[PDB]
From a paper:
Trimeric coronaviral spike glycoproteins form prominent features on viral particles that are responsible for the attachment to a receptor on the host cell and, ultimately, fusion of the viral and cellular membranes. Encoded by a single viral gene, the mature spike glycoprotein comprises two subunits, S1 and S2, which mediate binding to the receptor and facilitate fusion, respectively. The recognition of the betacoronavirus SARS-CoV-2 host receptor, the cellular membrane protein angiotensin-converting enzyme 2 (ACE2), maps to the S1 C-terminal domain (referred to as the receptor binding domain, RBD), while the function of the N-terminal domain (NTD) remains enigmatic. Here we show that the NTD of SARS-CoV-2 spike binds biliverdin with high affinity.
Next, we imaged single particles of the trimeric SARS-CoV-2 spike ectodomain in the presence of excess biliverdin using cryo-EM. Using cryo–electron microscopy and x-ray crystallography, we mapped the tetrapyrrole interaction pocket to a deep cleft on the spike N-terminal domain (NTD). The recruitment of the tetrapyrrole leads to stabilization of the NTD structure and makes the viral envelope glycoprotein refractory to neutralization by a subset of human antibodies. Because biliverdin binding conceals a deep hydrophobic cleft on the NTD, we suspected that it may mask or modify the antigenic properties of the viral spike. Biliverdin levels in plasma of healthy individuals (0.9 to 6.9 μM) and more so under pathological conditions (>50 μM) greatly exceed the Kd of its interaction with the spike (~10 nM) and are therefore sufficient to impinge on SARS-CoV-2 antigenic properties and neutralization.
Author numbering:
A (entry chain B): 713 to 828, 848 to 1146
B (entry chain C): 614 to 617, 633 to 676, 689 to 761
C (entry chain C): 960 to 1146
The structure:
């Protein structure tokens, strides 16, 4: 079966890269403003030093994940003012020159679909949220440079110095990477453009509709909010003491009888803090693994043409475009898919004069009466000649060889 | 988490950032690669008299490829480059023992420690 | 080190030395103090065990990545981009460091570049010629065919291009002539 038509398909893939950075303080959480509580808490050697060290390690790793993912270009490229890409329309992903935040339309749709006083109550107990190193105005610049590098220089900018090339010619360089000849593109170029734009038109209409695609990027926020809410709720627990608030205990009890109650409260809150620290340490590993996978996809899918199957989408990979979502990355993969196929009768070789001819690169087919040679991934019949096949042995050992004739395109010219 | 007030003692060159209040650093308009990450797109460094400066870190040199619809660029010379990459493979192997750690050479401690069934196992 | 420091802590007991407690206290009131010490040290040990268990996973992931790099970068030529260095990968060398490995990657990088005017195809006699493997370029007056990653001009012939269709559907096709390196020999 040989295909006869093709289809360009653009798909989306979401990936979390980093989470929120938080820090907690024992002196404010376990004891608050009290002093007798701190004096008793000093009896535990260095439980809080390691608890505050682990969170600092997680926070410093979160700012390295994003740096690994996005920061892969040493030069901030810029698309030329004249938009002449041979019919392809990139205005839906190129940065908007009007809105103050230079983010493309699809980035705005991605940002509006994620929903990042509850906050004050958390902050009042020594819990703080540190700001990330890279603001969105810089991540957007990085993705804009990455996207403007691929559409004007190909894969060359990822391995040295960017070298310009017309887009309609690299779109053929990329067809040669999957097994289709150049002349397929140049003779169907308009059609392919009229396909690609349409695919882009179906992306935003899928993100602006009532669909749950960024949910994998929202579960990360939900888990982090839930853990903090539970940690704050743990302060309203007796843990065996007479009262759950420390000021009351200090107010209506002498030190000798207050020390045991304070110790019970301290051990309860210490366990409640250690559990949260362990959970965050476990979750950071999953976030790190996802960030590494996203960095690999950026390196290979975007800055080159991948040949690994089902890695950069479904189909034959052509190119990819990156976009930034709140605390994550979105990849738009462009793929080539055969559409319409037809049956044919095949044969391994052809015996002409006691010699067996094999296809140089292609396959023999037949429409019922004559035999042609065609490329594997597209239908394009051709006449069998000697400048197109190669000979090896005689037609005795091949299983399904058949009679036929070979052109040998040199006899008529000599006459 | 201070607006700049809430500061006990201040001085000269007080600079306001999105990450908080900065005292002891002089603000400039230049932009270099990050040296000490202050946060929220602000970095700090020590330079030339000698002082500590805080700036908005830059991303890299900006250029525009001379893109045209019938223009290509072809290389003519090459270069062989050798780079290094470090990777950890393993760490140290350590072992600990409760009876020597928690109790030491004592005997009455082991009898009490036996009340916890299979913790040290 | 931190683990050892946890032996120098009261944890609520009268003293942090077990021999001191056992030396000056009879069993009935010594038991509670010893129990406090035991539970404190048990927690101090569990924390260390959990931290080591978490760190071992990161070490294992790094070891797996190093094994993959040794299998692919070293024992073959990789085509994955930015995996075995920056540039086009050629070969690699392994070296050993205390508790780790060091890879020396050799890569090929283009250095100097020049501008040219390109064209998708060539129309000779109502037929469109496409490059078999390469690209058409021009130095201003004549047209040549050259490989993509290096500059090596060549004369356009028929044993170097292939024909498909007529020059009506290609966007930027141009007039030119093709050698057909067989006419002069027959004469
Ligand atoms: C290959 O498929 C394309 C589209 O899938 C076909 O182009 C369509 O042709 C019909 C009628 O000829 C038009 O009504 C459509 O608008 C075309 N599609 C587009 C996107 O323009 C094309 O004809 C097919 N080729 C073959 C040989 O069947
Ligand atoms: C590329 O896509 C943009 C976005 O759809 C097109 O701009 C639209 O043009 C139509 C006119 O046919 C207007 O009604 C829309 O309001 C425009 N949209 C936007 C967002 O500006 C554009 O025409 C397409 N083609 C080119 C060559 O740019
Ligand atoms: C198989 O393909 C061959 C070659 O295209 C077809 O033969 C041609 O058929 C047309 C239609 O009548 C004639 O005008 C040509 O003169 C034929 N060429 C030759 C060399 O005979 C053939 O008809 C096709 N068979 C089927 C079943 O489609
Ligand atoms: C291809 O054709 C040749 C002759 O042109 C076939 O060779 C003869 O085949 C017949 C029928 O099988 C035998 O009786 C003869 O003994 C063969 N040899 C001769 C005539 O010298 C050959 O078999 C054909 N290939 C096939 C059928 O696969
Ligand atoms: C930091 O504190 C100053 C002083 O209170 C704030 O400045 C005031 O802002 C309000 C808001 O409208 C104005 O009505 C006052 O006139 C301002 N006073 C002065 C002296 O500037 C400032 O807004 C605070 N910083 C932030 C980020 O809110
Ligand atoms: C390609 O580059 C190499 C080195 O980058 C050039 O070789 C140098 O040539 C100059 C003078 O011709 C010598 O002084 C250097 O010592 C050479 N370098 C080395 C490493 O030997 C070479 O000339 C360049 N080729 C072209 C065509 O420009
Ligand atoms: C473009 O290349 C052609 C071919 O190398 C150059 O033509 C040659 O120029 C030299 C220099 O005078 C002459 O000796 C040859 O006889 C020319 N060959 C032919 C076939 O005419 C041409 O000069 C180059 N153009 C530029 C601008 O460099
Ligand atoms: C390549 O050359 C042919 C003739 O050798 C051009 O065909 C003629 O072009 C002129 C000017 O465009 C027209 O007025 C004629 O009607 C064309 N046909 C003839 C003379 O039979 C062809 O256009 C050239 N290719 C280009 C310019 O891309
Ligand atoms: C090829 O032949 C099979 C067998 O009858 C048939 O089921 C199939 O539909 C044919 N292919 C196409 C594209 O119709
Ligand atoms: C295919 O199978 C048929 C039996 O249905 C047999 O006659 C024929 O020789 C086989 N041909 C090949 C090439 O296997
Ligand atoms: C930085 O530039 C602005 C405007 O260009 C200017 O007002 C300001 O004074 C400059 N900074 C310093 C420290 O002079
Ligand atoms: C190619 O032309 C552009 C446009 O003027 C120019 O900026 C560039 O420097 C040229 N290439 C080289 C290698 O000089
Ligand atoms: C390139 O653009 C120019 C306009 O600047 C136009 O005249 C020419 O036909 C275009 N050629 C191709 C091959 O796109």
């Amino acid at each position: 079966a040989i295909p006869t038509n093709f289809t360009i398909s653009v798909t989306t893939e979401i990936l979390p890269v980093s989470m929120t950075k938080t820090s907690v303080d024992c002196t404010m959480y376990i004891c608050g403003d009290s002093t007798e509580c701190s004096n008793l808490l000093l009896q535990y050697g260095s439980f809080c030093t390691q608890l505050n060290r682990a969170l600092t390690g997680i926070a410093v790793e979160q700012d390295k994940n994003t740096q690994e993912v996005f920061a892969q270009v040493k030069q901030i490229y810029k698309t030329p003012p004249i938009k002449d890409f041979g019919g392809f329309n990139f205005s839906q992903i190129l940065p908007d020159p009007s809105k103050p935040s230079k983010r493309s339309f699809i980035e705005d749709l991605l940002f509006n679909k994620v929903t990042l006083d509850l906050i004050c109550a958390q902050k009042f107990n020594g819990l703080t949220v540190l700001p990330p190193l890279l603001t969105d105005e810089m991540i957007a610049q990085y993705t804009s440079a990455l996207l403007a590098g691929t559409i004007t220089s190909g894969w060359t900018f990822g391995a040295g110095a960017a070298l310009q090339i017309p887009f309609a010619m690299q779109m053929a360089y990329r067809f040669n990477g999957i097994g289709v000849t150049q002349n397929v593109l140049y003779e169907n170029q308009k059609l392919i453009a009229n396909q690609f734009n349409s695919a882009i038109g179906k992306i935003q209409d899928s993100l602006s509709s009532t669909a749950s695609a960024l949910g994998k990027l929202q579960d990360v926020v939900n888990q982090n909010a839930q853990a903090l809410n539970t940690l704050v709720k743990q302060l309203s627990s007796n843990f065996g003491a007479i009262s759950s608030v420390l000021n009351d205990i200090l107010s209506r009890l002498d030190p000798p009888e207050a020390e045991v109650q304070i110790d019970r409260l301290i051990t309860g809150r210490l366990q409640s803090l250690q559990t949260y620290v362990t959970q965050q340490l476990i979750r950071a590993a999953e976030i790190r693994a996802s960030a590494n996978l996203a960095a690999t996809k950026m390196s290979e899918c975007v800055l080159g043409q991948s040949k690994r199957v089902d890695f950069c989408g479904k189909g034959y990979h052509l190119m990819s475009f990156p976009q930034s979502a709140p605390h994550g990355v979105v990849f738009l993969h462009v793929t080539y898919v055969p559409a319409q196929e037809k049956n044919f009768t095949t044969a391994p070789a052809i015996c002409h004069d006691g010699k067996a001819h094999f296809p140089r690169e292609g396959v023999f087919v037949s429409n019922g009466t004559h035999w042609f040679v065609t490329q594997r991934n597209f239908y394009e019949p051709q006449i069998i000649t000697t400048d197109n096949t190669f000979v090896s042995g005689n037609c005795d050992v091949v299983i399904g060889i058949v009679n036929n004739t070979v052109y040998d395109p040199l006899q008529p010219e000599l006459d | 988490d201070v607006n700049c007030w809430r500061v006990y003692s201040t001085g000269s060159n007080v600079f306001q950032t999105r990450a908080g209040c900065l005292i002891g650093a002089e603000h400039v308009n230049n932009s270099y690669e990050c040296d000490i990450p202050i946060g929220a797109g602000i970095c700090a460094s020590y330079q030339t008299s000698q002082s500590i400066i805080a700036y908005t870190m830059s991303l890299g040199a900006e250029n525009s490829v001379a893109y045209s619809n019938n223009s290509i660029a072809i290389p003519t010379n090459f270069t062989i480059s050798v780079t290094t990459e470090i990777l950890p493979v393993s760490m140290t192997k350590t072992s600990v023992d409760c009876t020597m750690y928690i109790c030491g050479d004592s005997t009455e401690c082991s009898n009490l420690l036996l009340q916890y069934g299979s913790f040290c196992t």
